[PDB]
């Protein structure tokens, strides 16, 4: 619940609450009553929806890839990383370090690709989403032994069912995911520099269990990340310039702020 205002009458004293010294770095804790007369108003407003958990708990798509059931791209391979998208990435960046559990949800959508094969009566499609942990064997063809599933966590979802949702516990060798890393993987300081060097969360593979039918069908899989049980440390200024790459913080110089007419203009 937010703090309320306290009444004040006219004042005339040596003490000055307004005049301060911003050089110290202490933001003045001045309430409205300090520089005027105010009534006693009980503010029942609550800072409930501004909580870090409520701020970042919304499901937000990070990456969508499309795999056909017949042709060159039989299966889809995406390295896990929240940097691919923009809205969720920017939300997370606000904090230099962050420690959150994940609740991945997959929205899979099929589409009969235009073709000329007749008597297209396809049976219900079945899909498999496999999470390869880093250092694990990775599939090369749609039907390799890796797809059989030995110990990796995979979910089998027939089309038309409620979208699959598997929760992921915090997965980081360190004590918190580092949103920003001012360091190189190599002690020599030569090589990749940035968040990509320390963040590896495995790879995600999506394939058609059954070909489905005579005609080609293209399956779009959308991956949604919702941070839960989030704890954030060291708040940082929000990214002002548009993102240009996923593996680095490189940016294009942009105006501090959208301009207005004059210094006295009100638009």
């Amino acid at each position: 619940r937010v703090a309320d205002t306290v009444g004040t009458g006219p004042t005339n004293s040596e003490a000055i609450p307004a005049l301060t010294a911003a050089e110290t770095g202490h933001t003045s804790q001045v309430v409205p009553g300090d520089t005027m007369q105010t009534r006693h108003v009980k503010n029942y407003h609550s800072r409930s929806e501004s909580t870090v958990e409520n701020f970042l708990c919304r499901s937000a798509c990070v990456y969508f890839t499309e795999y056909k059931n017949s042709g060159s791209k039989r299966y889809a391979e995406w390295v896990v990383t929240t940097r691919q998208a923009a809205q969720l990435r920017r939300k997370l960046e606000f904090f230099t370090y962050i420690r959150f559990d994940l609740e991945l949800t997959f929205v899979i959508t099929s589409t009969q690709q235009p073709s000329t094969t007749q008597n297209q009566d396809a049976q219900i499609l079945t899909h498999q989403i496999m999470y390869v942990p880093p250092g694990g064997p990775v599939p090369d063809k749609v039907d390799s032994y890796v797809w059989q599933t030995s110990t990796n966590p995979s979910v089998f979802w027939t089309e038309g069912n409620a979208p699959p949702r598997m929760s992921i516990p915090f997965l980081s060798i360190g004590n918190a995911y580092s949103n920003f890393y001012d360091g190189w993987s190599d002690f020599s300081r030569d090589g990749v520099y940035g968040i990509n060097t320390l963040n590896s969360m495995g790879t995600l593979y999506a394939r058609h269990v059954n070909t489905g039918g005579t005609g080609p069908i293209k399956s779009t899989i959308r991956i949604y990340f919702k941070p839960k049980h989030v704890k954030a440390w060291i708040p940082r200024p929000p990214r002002l310039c548009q993102y240009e790459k996923a593996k680095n913080v490189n940016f294009q110089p942009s105006g501090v702020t959208t301009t207005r007419q004059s210094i006295t203009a009100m638009t």
């Binding site: 391979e77 390295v79 896990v80 390869v132 880093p134 250092g135 694990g136 064997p137 990775v138 599939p139 090369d140 993987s185 190599d186 030569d190 090589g191 990749v192 990509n196 060097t197 590896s200 969360m201 495995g202 790879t203």
Partner: protein, 105 residues
């Protein structure tokens, strides 16, 4: 993954040009290493632990790996004339990275 993916190497005619394609592999990367070099089309290929001349007429016997799976895929092109963008595409199943080098003279 590849160090300095955009590069502009200008070198005079007559001496070997060293084109680096040093790469670092993520833990998630456990795939056959396919290194392919392109010019603007395929100069060299590395699949199944062997090197391929690829019968490129402009650069046959003048292109070789300086070093390998250790992380180096550089090429020392010898006896330049060759001016163009040299693209090195180290390949892994989770991520495939490419490096473009503009060569002058």
């Amino acid at each position: 993954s590849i160090t300095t993916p955009e590069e502009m190497i200008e070198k005079a005619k007559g001496e070997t040009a060293y084109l680096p394609c040093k790469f670092t592999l993520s833990p998630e990367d456990q795939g056959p290493l396919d290194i392919e070099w392109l010019i603007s089309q395929v100069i060299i290929l590395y699949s199944g632990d062997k090197i391929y001349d690829d019968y490129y007429p402009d650069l046959k016997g003048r292109v070789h790996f300086t070093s390998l799976k250790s992380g180096d895929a550089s090429i020392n092109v010898t006896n330049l004339q060759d001016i163009g963008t040299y693209q090195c595409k180290v390949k892994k199943a989770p991520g495939v990275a490419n490096k473009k080098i503009h060569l002058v003279v």
